[PDB]
Design a protein around this ligand. Structure first.
Ligand SMILES: [Mg+2]
Ligand SMILES: [Zn+2]
Ligand SMILES: [Zn+2]
Ligand SMILES: [Zn+2]
Ligand SMILES: [Zn+2]
Lengths: 66, 49, 1157, 64, 85, 111, 49, 48, 49
RNA sequence: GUUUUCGUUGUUUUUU
């Protein structure tokens, strides 16, 4: 859950791309070209976004105590 | 590796299948990967050890 | 219609799980429990009669109670203040309650004084959390969104007192089968024909019989046969019991035994049996013979002796065949043929009976296990009505009838069996099975799923053997061949395969009708001459007919099971060679769905699949083009269930390639059967996928078929204990341990069954960068080198949660302890920890930075008598730090406040932390190095972790190399790579694509020494891999003890890292020290580091019998009046204990400080 | 070698526990029985497949 | 594994067939090893027989209880044993 | 081959009548005393190789799991046949596979 | 070379199969005919590997 | 000595009596029963 | 009749024909025993046993 | 107030 702020293998600012990545996904688009559009050049940065697993949406769909 | 079933080591082999593939001789290397029958035979050997 | 590919097979498996799933067996088992099993167990004896024969003139005042229908209620927990509410599982967990519902019955009364409705509460039944009567069954997901349950948490267990207990299914031998074994030669018995003849329905033991063959060859006289019938005190000859069972002439005994009359050897071998039974020439003398040894009482006389022998020949002898009258002729024929099989096995004309083939074994699920336990508990329920309606029948009072029904009868047996683990009664603690029910693990999500699909063989190490632990060919495709426990339980405790389903239990009578539909020849008709080669037909193991034209009937049964009129799981087996046939519908026989290759050679589909792309498209719709579910494929005759006993009689195609019988030089492909002499192969079936021989855990490994099987087993074992994310609502659960990864990552290498496992959604591990070399020298010996930058960014950072449970207690009725802040005045015997964190109610606030030596839950307990209160608090664990995640305040069941405090900590890797790959590659961290010191690539790229090359020569993980290569390729191309076993992928093509990726085909790349930037001479194989964090850390085992608490009895250092345990010095360590000449060292290890007391013993008697007082300086040996000849002894306290029990056993071990000479 | 058996059988005459003695003589294939308190006698036929329990059972059949 | 490492004399240790004879003289032989078959007759006449299997044989050898203790032996097993019936 | 009496049905014990000096098969329970077709009393061969052909079932030709072959068939002459072996479990059971076919069923050797 | 070595060993195995299945396999000292077949095929396939 | 079979904590403070103590109590109560077997009416088998 | 069978069964086993009792079989075994050379060195010798 | 106070049976699973 939640993409890392900094790239584990490299250290590039990557966090502010997730919403953009979903935007790219919506138009039935291939993955790799979209990642390249996201300036993901190092394949470490590339699979970090490619293979990230966000999980808060199920956690947030739980009705909280407040 | 003997014929575990009735006169056969696997249902994919036949009765009295004296040929190597039906009795546990590996025909592959670890590079190539192993067929399911002989994979089960290597499982035999590993569990034996 | 067209050829069947792999993705079509995947779609078939999608239908399979969308209808069945993987809990279907458990669900249907427990539903069968409370839909057929419970009612039958209730009404298995529906008649309760009492009487008062005397006067009232003369009368039979007949108190007669008739049983009736049961009642099921929806879960309601009934608070202890009359504020009754319908119970929700979340509340049950929060308040430590049992997922149990009340049940009721109609035990109506019928009074019959002769001259000669009512709804009581039976008890409260714990319920499996996804049965049809579960509280949240009809409620939809949004309702579930209001009750806070993890949608991926898939039930299948039981909730008792807030603890989740799962009933482990127990595998046991299928009954009602002949079991001839070779008895030891130095014994009068040669071959033991055994049959556990017990009622098929219920699958419960009624009796068994073992016929033993006496004598040897040219030794031990004739080949006499005398078996010990159940409850007889002597081996009675078989010919004699044949006389007693109706057929007194011996030719009838042979007509029952002899069925190949062309043989003379068996005739001359049964001649001695005729000679010895010749003393018996009629049924009367034979029955008296049996009754004399029948273990009955004395004075029964010949008449009742014969009657009891006849009954025991009738009941408890072949009870699965019959217990009533009329089939004693069937008894004679069945016993004759069973003796014949015994004799043929003795002659070794047939291979001796195998002891592992699952076809003779079943699996008792939660259903029949609970059925048996309920049988026990209810058999001690129906009787306490009698044992109370006798003390009141003499008074003939207006009995309430709601006070004689001790309803907690069936509460406590189930509570003890599910809580302690012993399936029986606490009084009968001995001879009880332990482990059938165990606490559900939620360490990881699979720690539940796989946990819900175990099997166990409860034989015991009574005789070690390898057969219960060794994999067998019959285990192919039916169980996971890599998932096994460690040493003590390795091989045992076995898991299913992926597509398995268990027979929930169908009535056998429909099968009886299906078989009798083909002109069955009765067992009475079975004759040596007439039926010289006819087919003997058996049901569930009971021999129930003969036939001479069996091909038509077996074909019809096969096609009918393809149709669905026969329950699709019912096993049909045709023993062509031994002129036999057998149908099995008993509970516990496990089946796999096989693609139905046309076996009747009448079409091109012979050697092809009945299921075609039409069926695949229909399934892809999810419905039918006028529904097409999984049962649609099963009942359409294109896929059918098969058991192992059926499997050994069928020939199955591995992949869609060898279906049609076939008619170069590639070093990246596998091998099918050669087909050189056997030019033809009519495979009757084909698996949906060979990769489905795997297990739930095995469906995780990338190419598990390219690595050593022992490493595959190690992977299977470590997979359940690998760190990850178990449940979505981990927070609302107050569990002993909870582990959640900061950043779960879907593996770059994936299987296709992965897709079904939803591993993208609950991934265990991260894709981190590894390079192979020997750079630091610290990578040796299972150690890895780590990138510090990734750790700082949080790679494999995680969250741990620990829930402490506390509660107030009732010493009396009003005497209660309270959760309050301990102080120096009201509280005595305080502890050095800081109590300040407590505020008003002995509860710390949520979010405070808790640590050890600090009280988190304060409790004060009364002292038995002004200043009569003791600290009973439970502070945080000494070497544990973190922040309080959550504080739950509730009550218990009745009246005491119950608090659940979960504390949260962040875990970060450190030198020594344990990790493993998906290829058995396990090790700890050896050293961590920062970015600048480790070498970089041409693009200046460093790995996250470094491993030892020495694993490859030794551990030989080719699949790890393939995984790393595919990982590089996927990361560059930006997609999820597939690693499903038994697929057509080739490494050479991947290397070519890597060339296309502008990278070296074999993955090598120049590193530049981090300290110097110099091009390291070799080009380093360097890229991503999917690894997993493991439960074992370094700092949980660091433990030093110079002096701590000592055990209350031994006066020696305690054991256990929890309570400052000492190092238990093994005896081999003593021996090696002795060989090392370590006298003083070992002495002080036993003197100062261990128990050491000084005493004053006598010099006359030489015993410790001396009243001793150092301050008084008086030492009087009351034994010998010795005061001056008293010696001081500084010896271990354990020596004092030894001397003590030696004295206590009236033994006098006279210690002497001198030498008698 | 003859084998006396100190049986625990109780006869109906003297109501003395530990009184009946069952001795089998298979040299002549003929059994034997006595008592130690009332000193009764009993005889039953013993074949190649006969036991002292058979002796007592046949005695129960005969006397009663 | 009861097994005795008998060392033959130098001249036998360089010999085989005499060593073979010693080996056969050490290998315990009973008719049990070499008995091919056994069929007991009650021969009606003590000094002859009425069966084709031994008529000429007993006519040649005979030149008491008529019950017959008859058995057959294997010629090949005799010659492998290096014995005769 | 041993047999039982018609009415006694117990063992036909072979014995001598000294008056005639011939072999009998006389049941002891009753007066049934039959003559012996052969004065042979008890045949107990110490090498057993019989019975491997008496117990043959008809529908063995309709058994799908059997191996195929290019081996020959004297009777059915099918060019795709099955091969089984002697039923003996003896240690010295020679691995002489007795070939068989769909229509033959005979226990014949193609050695 | 590996492939043809394995194939040649398989052919030798099939030859041993034929000899055993027609009793043409000469008996080894202290090694029964079927077990001789199994053992010699084992030796052959180990030689293959 | 009581040190040998001390008050062993069945629950933290609540001590369950030692197995040795239990058995000693049983033996001694049986012994006192035997001591009572003489002065009372003991019809033969009761003493046994 | 019975005594004839008893004697037959007994003497099927209690007729010692030849051989040393307690020795079911013997093996014809080589031994490469070392013996010195007349010139002074050593050399192995095949000796049967 | 120097000092200063927890334990066991049974059950399961485990760890090179
Ligand atoms: Mg270790
Ligand atoms: Zn990166
Ligand atoms: Zn003294
Ligand atoms: Zn008497
Ligand atoms: Zn008769």
């Amino acid at each position: 859950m939640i993409i890392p702020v900094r790239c584990f293998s490299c250290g590039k600012v990557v966090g502010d791309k997730w919403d953009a990545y979903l935007r790219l996904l919506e138009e039935g688009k291939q993955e790799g070209d979209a990642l390249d559009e996201l300036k993901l050049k190092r394949y470490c940065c590339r699979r970090m976004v490619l293979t990230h697993v966000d999980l808060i949406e199920k956690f947030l769909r739980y009705n909280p105590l407040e | 590796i003997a014929f575990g079933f009735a006169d056969r080591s696997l249902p994919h082999f036949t009765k009295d299948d004296f040929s190597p593939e039906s009795k546990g001789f590996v025909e592959n290397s670890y590079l190539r990967g192993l067929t399911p029958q002989e994979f089960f035979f290597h499982a035999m050997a590993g569990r034996e050890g | 219609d067209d050829t069947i590919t792999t993705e079509d097979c995947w779609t078939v498996i999608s239908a399979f799980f969308e209808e069945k799933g993987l809990v279907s067996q458990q669900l249907d088992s427990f539903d069968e429990f409370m839909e057929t099993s419970i009612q039958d167990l209730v009404w298995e004896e529906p008649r309760l009669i009492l009487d008062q024969p005397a006067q009232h003139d003369n009368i039979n005042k007949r108190y007669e109670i008739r049983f009736g229908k049961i009642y099921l209620s929806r879960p309601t927990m009934t608070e202890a203040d009359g504020t009754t509410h319908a119970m929700f599982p979340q509340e049950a967990r929060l308040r430590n309650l049992t997922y149990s519902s009340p049940v009721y019955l109609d035990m109506e009364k019928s009074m019959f004084t002769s001259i000669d409705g009512n709804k009581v509460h039976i008890g409260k039944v714990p319920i499996m959390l996804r049965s049809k009567f579960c509280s949240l069954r009809t409620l939809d997901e949004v309702d579930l969104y209001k009750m806070k349950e993890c949608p991926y948490d898939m039930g299948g267990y039981f909730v008792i007192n807030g603890s989740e207990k799962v009933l482990i299914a127990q595998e046991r031998s299928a009954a009602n089968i002949v079991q001839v074994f070779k008895k030891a030669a130095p014994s009068p018995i040669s071959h033991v024909a055994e049959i556990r003849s017990a009622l098929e329905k219920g699958s419960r033991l009624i009796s068994t019989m073992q016929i033993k063959l006496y004598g040897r060859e040219d030794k031990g006289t004739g080949r006499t046969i005398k078996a010990t019938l159940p409850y007889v005190k002597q081996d009675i000859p078989i010919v004699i019991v044949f006389r007693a069972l109706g057929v007194v002439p011996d030719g009838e005994i042979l007509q029952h035994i002899c069925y190949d009359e062309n043989d003379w050897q068996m005739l001359e071998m049964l001649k001695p049996c005729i000679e010895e039974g010749f003393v018996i020439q009629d049924k009367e003398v034979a029955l008296d013979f049996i009754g004399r040894r029948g273990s009955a009482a004395l004075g029964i006389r010949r008449e009742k002796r014969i009657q009891y022998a006849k009954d025991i020949l009738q009941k408890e002898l072949l009870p699965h065949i019959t217990q009533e009258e009329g089939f004693e002729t069937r008894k004679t024929f069945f016993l004759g043929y069973m003796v014949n099989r015994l004799l043929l096995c003795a002659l070794e004309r047939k291979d001796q009976d195998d002891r592992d083939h699952f076809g003779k074994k079943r699996l008792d699920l939660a259903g029949p296990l609970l059925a048996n336990l309920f049988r026990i508990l209810f058999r001690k329920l129906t009787r306490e009505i009698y044992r109370y309606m006798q003390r009141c029948i003499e008074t003939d009072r207006d009995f309430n009838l709601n006070l004689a029904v001790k309803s907690t009868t069936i509460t406590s047996g189930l509570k003890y069996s599910l809580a302690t683990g012993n399936w029986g009664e606490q009084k009968k603690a001995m001879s009880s099975r332990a482990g059938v029910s165990q606490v559900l693990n939620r360490y990881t999500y699979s720690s539940t799923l796989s946990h819900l699909r175990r099997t166990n063989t409860p034989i015991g190490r009574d005789g070690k053997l390898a057969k219960p632990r060794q994999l067998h060919n019959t285990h192919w495709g039916l169980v996971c061949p890599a998932e096994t426990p460690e040493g003590q339980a390795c091989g045992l405790v076995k898991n299913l395969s992926l597509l398995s389903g268990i027979s929930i239990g169908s009535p056998s009578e429909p099968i009886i009708n299906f078989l009798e539909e083909w002109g069955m020849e009765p067992l009475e008709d079975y004759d040596p001459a007439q039926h010289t080669k006819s087919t003997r037909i058996f049901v569930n193991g009971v021999w129930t007919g003969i036939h001479r034209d069996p091909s038509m009937l077996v074909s019809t049964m096969r096609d009918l099971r393809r149709s669905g009129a026969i329950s699709p799981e019912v096993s049909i087996i045709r023993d062509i060679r031994e002129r036999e046939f057998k149908i099995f519908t008993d509970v516990g026989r496990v089946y796999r769905p096989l693609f139905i290759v046309e076996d009747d050679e009448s079409k091109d589909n012979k050697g092809e699949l009945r299921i075609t792309k039409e069926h695949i498209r229909k399934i892809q719709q999810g419905y039918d083009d006028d529904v097409y579910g999984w049962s649609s494929l099963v009942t359409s005759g294109v896929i059918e269930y098969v058991d192992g006993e059926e499997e050994e009689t069928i020939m199955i195609a591995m992949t869609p390639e060898d279906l049609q019988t076939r008619s170069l030089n590639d070093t990246a492909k596998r091998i099918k059967p050669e087909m050189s002499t056997s030019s033809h192969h009519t495979f009757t079936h084909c698996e949906i996928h060979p990769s489905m021989i795997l297990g739930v855990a095995a469906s995780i490994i990338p190419f598990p078929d390219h690595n050593q099987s022992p490493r595959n087993t190690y992977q299977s074992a470590m997979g359940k204990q690998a760190m990850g994310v178990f449940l979505t609502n981990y927070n609302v659960r107050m569990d002993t341990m909870a582990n959640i990864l900061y950043y779960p990552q879907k593996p770059l290498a994936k299987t296709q069954a992965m897709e079904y496992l939803k591993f993208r959604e609950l991934p265990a591990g991260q894709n981190a960068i590894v390079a192979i070399a020997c750079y630091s020298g610290y990578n040796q010996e299972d150690s890895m080198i780590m990138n510090q930058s990734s750790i700082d960014r949080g790679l494999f950072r995680s969250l741990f949660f620990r829930s402490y449970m506390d509660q107030e207690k009732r010493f009396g009725i009003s005497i209660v302890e309270e959760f309050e802040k301990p102080t120096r005045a009201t509280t005595l015997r305080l502890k050095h920890g800081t109590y300040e964190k407590l505020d008003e109610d002995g509860l710390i606030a949520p979010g405070v930075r808790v640590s050890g030596d600090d009280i988190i839950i304060g409790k004060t307990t009364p002292i038995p008598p002004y200043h009569t209160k003791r600290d009973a608090s439970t502070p945080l664990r000494s070497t544990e730090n973190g922040i309080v995640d959550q504080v739950l305040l509730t009550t218990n069941q009745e009246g005491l406040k119950f608090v659940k405090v979960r504390m949260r900590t962040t875990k970060v890797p450190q030198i020594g932390d344990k990790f493993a790959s998906r290829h058995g590659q396990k090790g700890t961290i050896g050293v961590t190095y920062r970015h600048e010191d480790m070498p970089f690539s041409a693009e200046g790229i460093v790995p996250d972790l470094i491993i030892n090359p020495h694993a490859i020569p030794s551990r030989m993980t080719v699949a790890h190399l393939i995984e790393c290569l595919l990982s590089k390729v996927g990361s560059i191309r930006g997609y999820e790579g597939d690693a499903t076993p038994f697929t057509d992928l080739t490494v050479d093509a991947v290397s070519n694509l890597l060339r296309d990726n502008g990278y070296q085909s074999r993955g090598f790349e120049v590193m530049y020494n981090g300290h110097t930037g110099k091009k390291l001479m070799a080009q380093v194989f360097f890229g991503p891999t999917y690894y997993q964090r493991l439960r074992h850390m370094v700092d949980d085992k660091i433990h030093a003890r110079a002096r701590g608490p000592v055990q209350v009895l031994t006066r020696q250092p305690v054991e256990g890292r929890s309570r400052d345990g000492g190092l238990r010095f093994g005896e081999m360590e003593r021996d090696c020290m002795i060989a090392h000449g370590a006298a003083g060292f070992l002495k002080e290890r036993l003197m100062e580091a261990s128990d050491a007391f000084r005493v004053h013993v006598c010099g006359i008697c030489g015993l410790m019998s001396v009243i001793a007082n150092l301050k008084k300086n008086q030492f009087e040996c009351r034994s010998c009046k010795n005061k001056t000849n008293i010696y001081q002894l500084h010896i271990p306290y354990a020596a004092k204990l030894l001397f003590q029990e030696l004295m206590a056993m009236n033994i006098a071990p006279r210690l002497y400080t001198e030498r008698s000479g | 070698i003859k084998q006396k058996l100190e049986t625990q059988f109780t006869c109906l005459f003297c109501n003395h526990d530990n009184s009946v003695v069952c001795t089998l003589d298979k040299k002549n294939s003929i059994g034997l029985l006595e008592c130690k308190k009332c000193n009764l006698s009993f005889q039953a036929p013993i074949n190649s497949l006969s036991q002292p329990i058979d002796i007592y059972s046949d005695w129960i059949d005969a006397c009663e | 594994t009861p097994a005795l490492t008998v060392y033959l004399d130098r001249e036998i240790a360089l010999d085989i067939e005499k060593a073979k004879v010693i080996q056969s003289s050490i290998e315990y032989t009973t008719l049990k090893n070499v008995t091919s078959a056994t069929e007991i007759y009650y021969d009606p006449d003590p000094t002859s027989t009425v069966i084709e299997e031994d008529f000429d044989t007993v006519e040649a050898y005979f030149s008491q209880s008529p019950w017959l203790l008859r058995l057959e032996l294997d010629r090949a097993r005799m010659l492998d044993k290096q014995l005769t019936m | 081959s041993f047999r039982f009496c018609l009415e006694c049905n117990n063992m036909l014990y072979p014995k001598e009548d000294k008056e005639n000096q011939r072999l009998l098969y006389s049941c002891r329970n009753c007066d049934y005393t039959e003559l012996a077709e052969d004065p042979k009393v008890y045949r107990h061969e110490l090498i057993t190789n019989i019975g491997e052909t008496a117990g043959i079932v008809d529908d063995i030709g309709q058994d799908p799991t059997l191996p195929r072959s290019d081996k020959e068939c004297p009777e059915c002459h099918s060019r795709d046949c099955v091969f089984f072996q002697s039923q003996q479990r003896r240690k010295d059971t020679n691995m002489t596979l007795f070939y068989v076919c769909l229509n033959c069923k005979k226990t014949f050797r193609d050695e | 070379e590996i492939t043809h070595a394995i194939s040649s060993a398989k052919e030798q195995v099939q030859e041993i199969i034929y000899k055993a299945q027609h009793n043409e396999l000469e008996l080894k000292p202290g090694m029964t005919l079927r077990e001789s077949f199994e053992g010699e095929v084992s030796r052959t396939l180990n030689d293959a590997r | 000595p009581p040190q040998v079979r001390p008050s062993i904590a069945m629950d933290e403070t609540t001590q369950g009596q030692d197995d040795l103590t239990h058995k000693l109590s049983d033996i001694l109560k049986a012994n006192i029963n035997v001591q009572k077997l003489e002065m009372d009416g003991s019809p033969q088998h009761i003493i046994n | 009749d019975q005594m004839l069978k008893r004697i037959e069964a007994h003497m099927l086993d209690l007729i010692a024909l030849r051989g040393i009792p307690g020795i079911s079989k013997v093996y014809m075994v080589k031994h490469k025993v070392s013996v010195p050379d007349e010139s002074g060195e050593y050399k192995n010798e095949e000796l049967w046993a």
